[PDB]
Symmetry: D2
Subunit: 144 residues, 4 copies
């Protein structure tokens, strides 16, 4: 199995909007995306307004993540992204959750509006992520 690292995004997030928590569904929060820098070989630009990661930390500590946001490239192209994934920590970090620690991986789906980016809607992708301060680093890999 082969793959190609195609780009990265460093995203600056705002404080979580905590919606609610219990020990049946877990804890729901919305994470607003403030900004984001996109970079890669011929794939450079920024994250657009309107971005939100909708997250639930399940009672067992597993986080399920579903982000919806858009980017615009420096050539003028826009790409809409839905990024669906998981973040799990080992045992001594679980009550904290509810940095090297995490397993944090996602699958993005892309929607594009010009022939130059049609390939993004015709391959499978994996994203390897990390969180920091309040800014997640995302590496995107095209499955070859």
């Amino acid at each position: 199995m082969n793959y190609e690292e195609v780009f990265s995004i460093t995203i600056t997030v705002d404080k979580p909007i905590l919606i609610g928590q219990d020990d049946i569904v877990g804890r729901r929060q919305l994470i607003p995306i403030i900004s984001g820098k996109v970079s890669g070989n011929n794939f450079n630009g920024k994250v657009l307004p309107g971005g939100i990661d909708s997250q639930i930390v399940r009672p067992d500590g597993k986080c399920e993540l579903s982000a919806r946001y858009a980017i615009r490239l420096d050539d003028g192209a826009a790409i809409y992204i839905e990024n669906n994934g998981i973040r799990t920590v080992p045992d001594e970090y679980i009550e904290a959750v509810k940095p090297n620690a995490y397993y944090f991986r996602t699958i993005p789906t892309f929607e594009t509006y010009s022939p130059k980016y049609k390939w993004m809607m015709n391959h499978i992708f994996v994203c390897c992520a990390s969180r920091l301060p309040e800014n997640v680093l995302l590496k995107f890999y095209k499955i070859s």
Copy 2:
């Protein structure tokens, strides 16, 4: 033969669309921020919380597919997370505009929201949403 009960309404104030892109294959994608919203109904009263976005695509044939993610808080302190998925088609009074919401709740008083099917009838002005519990 199909019964239902109207359970609450939300009048939502939206910001201007964040247009992402458009072409003649996928259509036009935009994100609509929800500025605010008033929730009202029999023992179901409160407001829409921050962080709300309706993600819409207008298909080339004109059909709009809608998927909104937002939360509300009630005046009893209960919070509810809503994903509302539906369609809007035209040939204001013009539209067919109907959606299916899915609820996530965090207390026994509201768990019935996770155990029924619902339909939402909407109107685009702001947007007015009437929620019906299918009996």
Copy 3:
């Protein structure tokens, strides 16, 4: 103020469940093959095609989440592909019976679903452009309503 129209019904015969597995967090997963089915409704008459499966999970709290994929062929030769997703619940007194599978009175059930359609002719494209609700019961009888 919500209007709807009954558009058709389907009476489905199903095989015995294919029990996959169960535990006390995810619940009980089973696949239900659809043997046959008859579609009827004003100018809407046909049959269920081969290949139909309802993938079901009865959650530890007793709620059944249903997802069926199947197709129908109408007497004019048109096909409709259906994914029907919904839920089936019972009052607390019947839950132990459900978790077993001992007989429960069909009137105990709340059994409602939301169908999505895929069609391949102009005469049926409306089914792709309205919202629908399905009221079901124990054959399985499904009644389909277009929301107006």
Copy 4:
């Protein structure tokens, strides 16, 4: 970088397609029954159970969107329920072939999917807590499953 582990393979025998319908906007929808299948991999050996269907649509532009629901039973008695969703494309020169369904060489395909698992035992709960990628090809479909580390 991205690391991964091959976890197991499945070789599946499928029946003939159940053609539902086709048009030039939605494409061609068919249901593919899974007759049988053999699961193999280090400490991961079993069979596919009854009830498996791949629901597929070949879009007007030639791209096939695949969604399979089936289950396997391992030799230690554990079950795994699999929802496997993916895509299968060919170069432009083979698209017409893909359409009347003429022979296209196996090496021509891009055929990749993302499986989701449901398991009922602590020994296999890790399958619910990792991301996976599946590489597939075409007498059978060969699926190789990879855990993303």
